[PDB]
Nucleic acid binder design. Structure first.
Ligand SMILES: [Mg+2]
Ligand SMILES: [Mg+2]
Ligand SMILES: [Mg+2]
Ligand SMILES: [Mg+2]
Ligand SMILES: [Mg+2]
Ligand SMILES: [Mg+2]
Ligand SMILES: [Mg+2]
Ligand SMILES: [Mg+2]
Ligand SMILES: [Mg+2]
Ligand SMILES: [Mg+2]
Ligand SMILES: [Mg+2]
Ligand SMILES: [Mg+2]
Ligand SMILES: [Mg+2]
Ligand SMILES: [Mg+2]
Ligand SMILES: [Mg+2]
Ligand SMILES: [Mg+2]
Ligand SMILES: [Mg+2]
Ligand SMILES: [Mg+2]
Ligand SMILES: [Mg+2]
Ligand SMILES: [Mg+2]
Ligand SMILES: [Mg+2]
Ligand SMILES: [Mg+2]
Ligand SMILES: [Mg+2]
Ligand SMILES: [Mg+2]
Ligand SMILES: [Mg+2]
Ligand SMILES: [Mg+2]
Ligand SMILES: [Mg+2]
Ligand SMILES: [Mg+2]
Ligand SMILES: [Mg+2]
Ligand SMILES: [Mg+2]
Ligand SMILES: [Mg+2]
Ligand SMILES: [Mg+2]
Ligand SMILES: [Mg+2]
Ligand SMILES: [Mg+2]
Ligand SMILES: [Mg+2]
Ligand SMILES: [Mg+2]
Ligand SMILES: [Mg+2]
Ligand SMILES: [Mg+2]
Ligand SMILES: [Mg+2]
Ligand SMILES: [Mg+2]
Ligand SMILES: [Mg+2]
Ligand SMILES: [Mg+2]
Ligand SMILES: [Mg+2]
Ligand SMILES: [Mg+2]
Ligand SMILES: [Mg+2]
Ligand SMILES: [Mg+2]
Ligand SMILES: [Mg+2]
Ligand SMILES: [Mg+2]
Ligand SMILES: [Mg+2]
Ligand SMILES: [Mg+2]
Ligand SMILES: [Mg+2]
Ligand SMILES: [Mg+2]
Ligand SMILES: [Mg+2]
Ligand SMILES: [Mg+2]
Ligand SMILES: [Mg+2]
Ligand SMILES: [Mg+2]
Ligand SMILES: [Mg+2]
Ligand SMILES: [Mg+2]
Ligand SMILES: [Mg+2]
Ligand SMILES: [Mg+2]
Ligand SMILES: [Mg+2]
Ligand SMILES: [Mg+2]
Ligand SMILES: [Mg+2]
Ligand SMILES: [Mg+2]
Ligand SMILES: [Mg+2]
Ligand SMILES: [Mg+2]
Ligand SMILES: [Mg+2]
Ligand SMILES: [Mg+2]
Ligand SMILES: [Mg+2]
Ligand SMILES: [Mg+2]
Ligand SMILES: [Mg+2]
Ligand SMILES: [Mg+2]
Ligand SMILES: [Mg+2]
Ligand SMILES: [Mg+2]
Lengths: 386, 109, 63, 183
RNA sequence: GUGAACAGCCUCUAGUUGAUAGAAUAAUGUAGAUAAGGGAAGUCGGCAAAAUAGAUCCGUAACUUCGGGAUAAGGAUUGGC
RNA sequence: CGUGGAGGUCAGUGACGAAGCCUAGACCGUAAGGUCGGGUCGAACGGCCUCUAGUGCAGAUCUUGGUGGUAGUAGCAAAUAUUCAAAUGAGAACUUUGAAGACUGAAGUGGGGAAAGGUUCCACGUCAACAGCAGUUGGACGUGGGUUAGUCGAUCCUAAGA
RNA sequence: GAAAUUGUUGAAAGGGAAGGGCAUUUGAUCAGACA
């Protein structure tokens, strides 16, 4: 007949199917366009989401009612200890698209990565890469010709890096391994860089700067089997209705005599891959640095770790990326942080932030104190104590 | 081999019982304890002193105390030979407060 | 073994409802043999079946 | 006797029946075939584990709308169950067969289960009361179980025909001349 | 016992402790609850739900067959010692 | 062409296996059908000329019986609730006993009766069926025992009415 | 001791039904006729 009243559909067909993702580690489906003039470096980084806190900073936005006034803003923190380079891989262009033609690997390999190549470490003979390692023995011969080959062909080059998950409060021991495209100039310069960094170790500050807009690729929190009303934000049906009301009344006209792909239906929700853009780096923390969570204006020595520690995560003892606002995935998830695919002018991007104060009170309750020192100050002396 | 030990343990019933539907708390406790024995003694066969049973139900179905101070005794089995030679007897110890004790070994004679 | 009949009998002999007769588990073979009221009567006399006390409903907080 | 089709040396076999048994015909079908052909000893350990929910029985025909379980991976299968009453009856006959083999003087070490067949015994009708004053069949669907063990034996040797070759005049001319010419 | 009470709630005597069971706690349900700010805009329609409530005192309109309307409406109060 | 029965006949077939049933074996017929082999079986049966009719099925929401897919599926979710140990037993979530936790809360889940049932009472034995899990338990199954009146009822009287 | 319908064994085939017609390959199986 015809709707009767018009309303936009419910939800975005550009995110179908709404199924569980094939992996916890969302995939980088694209890297920044290559400018071969710049020096070589990575174009992404691995980390784990620690949690969020609050920030206070002045705003620099000539025109806004809040120009030159303080604003308070939520930020997330991801734990970001140095990634370690263990291999290079060269791709070539084919009329069927890009294909991988070799992967070269570093001679020694941390148990952390070695562990990734397994489903039952404790029983296993740990034989992984133990013949490959031998390829170094003879002068170097075999490894060079591969490297050599890469250079001759290879339209792009990605580095094999993995995380130092042991430097992290997580239990999960099994490190994370992944390809990072390498944009600094010249294929041949690229693999030299790669070869050079084998078993060596790369840092965030060598990849990200303050105020830079980055993207976050991650697998969304999971919620399991989900009714139509919350999965799609369909309207609740009236209270009077037989056999349930978190439903959709009309699942389709009579013709096409087929339920159609375009209507809301109960099913899985969450654990989707998402590529989220334009998150701004408000802080690049440094692990070896008390007063991590101190400020030009704060001074008072303290790290970004909340009293009692990041709820459900731990402690942060490594460099970190502070990004304003919120981000796909949940606490403890592996997250890839990526270089933006365009140079935003925006004004909003470009603004050169500088924090005044980073909240540090407990997230496990209605926290009242930044530091034990503060709490001790205000409370006075207790029956425990001295 | 075997071993035959008696130790005295404190079990945290509270988090094991956290959430459990009221009419199943004292029952989950029984079971949850049994589980606690096999975890420590390795022993499938777990028996509960009627006294311990009383200590559990001492406050009604949903009023199970937050901590119990058990005494678990791994013992050898007898008669018509069950699958395993070993079993465990659990009993209540008569402690003032069950709060504050780590796990000790009971010297055997 | 099956001491229902002796339980009921116990109740009736003693003048008390079954919710208060006590048959001790340790003299279970002897009790079973007790098929009669004269037998239960002896069993009651020598403490293989005891009356079990009333349950207090004290008037003390009422008072 | 007169069991189902067998193909097996009865001099080296032993057998057992159960008839009119009150177990689910469908479930014990499924469990009978888990066992079918196994080393007798492997099978008895195996049902024991089933009972312990440590291995499972793969449900392969009588199985629509059945649970899924990791314990069917072993057998290439997602639907699998642990049908206790069946098992206990089936190992009941397995036990019996063993005894019979012992009595025959058959080598226990070589015993594989060579025939195991269940089919359908007479149904047993109870009845149930449906809404609006109606009645409905409520039926036990019981089983006959029958099995046969055998001593495994190696080899088979050879022996067959000899293939009577037939070839025309021009056909044994090539041949004749093949050796007259070459080797 | 509380209380106006053979009410509800808890107890003594007596009698039961029968009602397939285990493990989990997805969607959707059935039954039981709560929800900021707004307050019937929902809907055929306040359907459902919420609000009210005992007692003591004060106070009480239209109209009427003078019997009523009336617990009208509207208020305050209430433990322990 | 084929069936049941009848007259004639072939001195027809047959316990050295009639009839029947089974058989991607054989052969005759355009076809209805006919013939054979092998297996199974166990007491009867057929060819030809005639006679005769309760004589040929896929259907009739056909009749009666039997059987499936559905499917190990819907389900077995009201009445607050169960637990430890022992005993017994091939076997115990469910029986017995002890302990504990609760319930009915005298408008009872107590103690008795009327109508109705008719042995369900009680003991002993006891699990094939039945008690929509179970079962060693039962209002089940087997075998026994048990209902005592001058005063309690009936019996007498009258009621509507017959 | 038929049939529906079932278990086992053996052989085959199976990309959203199956079964059928003319024809031949391939496998299996078989009658007759030769003298
Ligand atoms: Mg329109
Ligand atoms: Mg997958
Ligand atoms: Mg190569
Ligand atoms: Mg919900
Ligand atoms: Mg919405
Ligand atoms: Mg939302
Ligand atoms: Mg309705
Ligand atoms: Mg809707
Ligand atoms: Mg909860
Ligand atoms: Mg039979
Ligand atoms: Mg089926
Ligand atoms: Mg089927
Ligand atoms: Mg279902
Ligand atoms: Mg299905
Ligand atoms: Mg299912
Ligand atoms: Mg599991
Ligand atoms: Mg499957
Ligand atoms: Mg019903
Ligand atoms: Mg009826
Ligand atoms: Mg030649
Ligand atoms: Mg009663
Ligand atoms: Mg019921
Ligand atoms: Mg249940
Ligand atoms: Mg959970
Ligand atoms: Mg509201
Ligand atoms: Mg208002
Ligand atoms: Mg309106
Ligand atoms: Mg209004
Ligand atoms: Mg409207
Ligand atoms: Mg209206
Ligand atoms: Mg209207
Ligand atoms: Mg209403
Ligand atoms: Mg309110
Ligand atoms: Mg009124
Ligand atoms: Mg009025
Ligand atoms: Mg006062
Ligand atoms: Mg004719
Ligand atoms: Mg005729
Ligand atoms: Mg006739
Ligand atoms: Mg056929
Ligand atoms: Mg022929
Ligand atoms: Mg023959
Ligand atoms: Mg014959
Ligand atoms: Mg005969
Ligand atoms: Mg004629
Ligand atoms: Mg006719
Ligand atoms: Mg026809
Ligand atoms: Mg027909
Ligand atoms: Mg017709
Ligand atoms: Mg018909
Ligand atoms: Mg029928
Ligand atoms: Mg079944
Ligand atoms: Mg079901
Ligand atoms: Mg229901
Ligand atoms: Mg109940
Ligand atoms: Mg029970
Ligand atoms: Mg009991
Ligand atoms: Mg009560
Ligand atoms: Mg009452
Ligand atoms: Mg009752
Ligand atoms: Mg009576
Ligand atoms: Mg009766
Ligand atoms: Mg009798
Ligand atoms: Mg009786
Ligand atoms: Mg039975
Ligand atoms: Mg009955
Ligand atoms: Mg039953
Ligand atoms: Mg039974
Ligand atoms: Mg009887
Ligand atoms: Mg009299
Ligand atoms: Mg008289
Ligand atoms: Mg017969
Ligand atoms: Mg074939
Ligand atoms: Mg053909």
């Amino acid at each position: 007949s015809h709707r009767k009243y018009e309303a936009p559909r419910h939800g975005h067909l550009g995110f179908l199917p709404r199924k569980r993702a094939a992996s916890i580690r969302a995939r980088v489906k694209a890297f920044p366009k290559d400018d071969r003039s710049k020096p070589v470096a990575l174009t992404s980084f691995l980390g784990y989401k620690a949690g969020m806190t609050t920030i206070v900073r002045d705003l620099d936005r000539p025109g806004s009612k809040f120009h030159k006034r303080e604003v308070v803003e939520a930020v997330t923190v991801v734990d970001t200890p140095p990634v370690v380079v263990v291999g290079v891989v060269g791709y070539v262009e084919t009329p069927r698209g890009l294909r991988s033609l070799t992967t070269v690997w570093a001679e020694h390999l941390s148990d952390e990565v070695k562990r990734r190549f397994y489903k039952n470490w404790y029983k296993s003979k740990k034989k992984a890469f133990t013949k490959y390692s031998a390829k170094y023995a003879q002068d170097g011969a075999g490894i060079e010709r591969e490297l050599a080959r890469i250079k001759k062909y290879a339209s792009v080059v990605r580095v094999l890096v993995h995380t130092q998950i042991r430097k992290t409060p997580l239990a999960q021991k099994k490190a994370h391994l992944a390809e990072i495209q390498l944009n600094g100039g010249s294929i041949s310069e690229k693999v030299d860089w790669a070869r050079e960094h084998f078993e060596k170790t790369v840092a965030v500050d060598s990849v990200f700067e303050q105020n830079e807009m980055i993207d976050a690729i991650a697998v969304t929190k999971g919620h399991g089997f989900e009714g139509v009303t919350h999965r799609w934000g369909t309207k609740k049906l009236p209270r009077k209705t037989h056999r349930g009301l978190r439903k959709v009344a009309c699942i389709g006209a009579w013709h096409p005599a087929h339920v159609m792909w375009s209507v809301a239906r109960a099913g899985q929700r969450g654990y989707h891959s998402r590529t989220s853009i334009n998150h701004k780096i408000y802080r690049v923390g440094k692990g070896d640095d008390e007063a991590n969570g101190a400020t030009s204006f704060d001074r008072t020595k303290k790290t970004i770790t909340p009293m009692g520690g990041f709820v459900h995560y731990g402690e942060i003892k490594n460099d970190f990326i502070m990004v304003k606002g919120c981000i796909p995935g949940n606490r403890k998830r592996i997250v890839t942080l990526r270089k933006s695919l365009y140079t935003n002018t925006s004004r909003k991007a470009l603004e050169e932030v500088s924090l005044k104060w980073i909240d540090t009170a407990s997230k496990f309750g209605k926290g009242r104190f930044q530091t034990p020192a503060e709490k001790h100050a205000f409370m006075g002396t207790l029956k425990k104590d001295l | 081999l075997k071993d035959v030990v008696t130790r005295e343990y404190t079990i945290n019933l509270h988090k094991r019982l956290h959430g459990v539907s009221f009419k199943k708390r004292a029952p989950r406790a029984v079971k949850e304890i049994k589980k606690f024995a096999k975890l420590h003694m390795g022993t499938d066969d777990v028996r509960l002193a009627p006294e311990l049973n009383q200590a559990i139900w001492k406050r009604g179905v949903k009023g199970v105390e937050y901590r119990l101070r058990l005494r678990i005794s791994r013992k050898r089995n007898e008669e018509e030979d069950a699958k395993n030679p070993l079993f465990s007897y659990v009993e209540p110890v008569l402690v003032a407060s069950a709060k504050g004790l780590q796990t000790v070994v009971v010297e055997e004679d | 073994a099956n001491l229902r009949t002796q339980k009921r009998l116990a109740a009736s002999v003693v003048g008390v409802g079954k919710r208060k007769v006590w048959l001790d588990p340790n003299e279970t073979s002897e009790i079973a043999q007790a098929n009669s009221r004269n037998a239960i009567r002896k069993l009651v006399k020598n403490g293989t079946i005891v009356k079990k006390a009333v349950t207090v409903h004290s008037k003390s907080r009422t008072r | 006797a007169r069991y189902g089709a067998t193909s097996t040396n009865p001099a080296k076999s032993a057998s057992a029946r159960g008839s009119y048994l009150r177990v689910s015909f469908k479930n014990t079908r499924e469990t009978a075939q888990a066992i079918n052909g196994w080393e007798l000893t492997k099978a008895q350990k195996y049902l024991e584990q089933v009972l312990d929910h440590q291995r499972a029985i793969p449900f392969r025909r009588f199985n629509s709308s059945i649970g899924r379980t990791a314990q069917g991976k072993e057998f290439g299968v997602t639907k699998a169950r642990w049908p206790a009453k069946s098992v206990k009856f089936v190992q009941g006959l397995l036990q019996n067969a063993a005894a019979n083999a012992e009595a025959k003087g058959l080598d226990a070490t070589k015993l594989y289960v060579s025939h195991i067949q269940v089919n359908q015994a007479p149904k047993q009708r109870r009845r149930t009361y449906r809404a609006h004053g109606r009645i409905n069949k409520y039926e036990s669907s019981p089983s006959h179980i029958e099995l046969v063990v055998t001593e495994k034996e190696e080899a088979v040797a050879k022996a067959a025909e000899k293939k009577v070759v037939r070839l025309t005049s021009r056909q044994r001319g090539r041949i004749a001349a093949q050796k007259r010419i070459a080797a």
